[PDB]
Amino acid sequence: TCPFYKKIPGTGFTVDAFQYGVVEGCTAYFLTHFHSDHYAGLSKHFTFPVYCSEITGNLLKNKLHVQEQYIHPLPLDTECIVNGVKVVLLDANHCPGAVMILFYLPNGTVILHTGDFRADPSMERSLLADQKVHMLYLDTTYCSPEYTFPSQQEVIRFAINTAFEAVTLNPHALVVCGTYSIGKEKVFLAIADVLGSKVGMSQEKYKTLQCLNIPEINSLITTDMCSSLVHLLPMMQINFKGLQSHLKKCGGKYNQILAFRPTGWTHSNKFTRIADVIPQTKGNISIYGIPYSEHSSYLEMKRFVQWLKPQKIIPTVNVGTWKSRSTMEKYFREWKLEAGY
Numbered sequence: 001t002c003p004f005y006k007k008i009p010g011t012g013f014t015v016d017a018f019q020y021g022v023v024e025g026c027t028a029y030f031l032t033h034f035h036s037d038h039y040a041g042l043s044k045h046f047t048f049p050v051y052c053s054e055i056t057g058n059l060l061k062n063k064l065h066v067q068e069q070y071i072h073p074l075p076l077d078t079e080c081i082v083n084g085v086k087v088v089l090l091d092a093n094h095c096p097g098a099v100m101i102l103f104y105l106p107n108g109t110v111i112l113h114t115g116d117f118r119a120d121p122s123m124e125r126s127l128l129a130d131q132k133v134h135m136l137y138l139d140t141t142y143c144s145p146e147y148t149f150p151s152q153q154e155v156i157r158f159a160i161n162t163a164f165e166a167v168t169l170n171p172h173a174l175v176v177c178g179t180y181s182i183g184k185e186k187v188f189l190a191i192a193d194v195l196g197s198k199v200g201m202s203q204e205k206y207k208t209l210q211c212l213n214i215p216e217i218n219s220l221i222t223t224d225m226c227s228s229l230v231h232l233l234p235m236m237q238i239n240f241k242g243l244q245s246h247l248k249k250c251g252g253k254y255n256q257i258l259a260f261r262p263t264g265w266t267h268s269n270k271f272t273r274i275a276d277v278i279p280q281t282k283g284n285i286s287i288y289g290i291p292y293s294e295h296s297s298y299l300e301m302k303r304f305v306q307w308l309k310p311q312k313i314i315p316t317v318n319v320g321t322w323k324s325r326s327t328m329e330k331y332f333r334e335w336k337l338e339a340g341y
């Protein structure tokens with residue numbers, strides 16, 4: 001049944017709760033972003049109101065065929081009224097169109113649901129600075145101190161320099177980047193930009209990117225693989241077998257592949273720096289795993305919470321085991337005692 005951490009008390013609202021059938025007493029279903037574990041269950045047959053960002057609404061209409069009359073897009077950074085309750089959508093610094101949601105309950109309680117987010121100091125100057133938040137429904141994906149990772153800027157710098165150097169040394173090398181969802185577009189777009197190429201991809205993925213309101217996107221992507229030297233493939237295909245195969249398909253236009261797999265975290269982060277990453281190589285194929293995260297590190301998450309000083313925290317990730325839940329609750333108590341709220 002719908003878990004309690006997907007329900008907003010004092011309202012008939014749910015968040016990211018589309019796979020439970022009809023949730024008894026739900027008058028409005030919010031969707032934070034277009035990732036499959038969150039939208040799971042939506043289709044052209046859904047007939048309740050869905051509240052979301054403009055970008056998420058484009059994706060619901062064009063990729064899932066949800067009917068327009070049930071899509072309610074809201075602008076960001078704007079006080080809006082939904083079924084008599086004041087709400088605001090904030091940028092979550094996750095994937096395109098991802099939001100956090102502030103609910104102002106009739107009784108005076110203020111609730112923030114982060115959806116999926118990568119905490120950033122910029123959030124400390126949004127409409128969040130303007131009032132107190134009593135309850136926080138928190139993306140705890142990486143809530144343990146082993147999870148450190150570099151800035152997104154540092155990671156894109158590494159990828160751009162690596163690709164530029166490789167292709168300048170060998171003009172017959174192909175760059176391949178893996179994907180399985182929206183998010184992390186900067187990786188492939190930054191590389192294509194430094195190389196003066198467009199990124200080539202399947203028709204389904206091209207359609208997905210045309211939903212995202214990215215400025216000048218017609219200048220950066222294409223469905224013509226042959227005119228492109230940065231290809232996007234399914235993440236499943238980013239291995240030596242899948243890449244040797246793909247190389248055959250280009251008909252000797254290329255003799256070398258350099259591939260990037262933008263992972264979340266991998267345990268080489270506990271030891272190694274970004275400057276010291278190395279690929280796995282077989283023959284003329286090299287695969288780089290790069291730690292490009294669209295979720296908070298442990299320290300980024302801790303700073304956000306110690307800034308916000310909520311009265312109660314409700315985790316939304318890693319809630320399935322007692323040992324995970326207990327460990328997270330220990331970190332929350334440390335944070336509160338260190339900061340004095």
Ligand code: NI
Nearest residue numbers: 033035094116
């Ligand atoms: Ni997500």
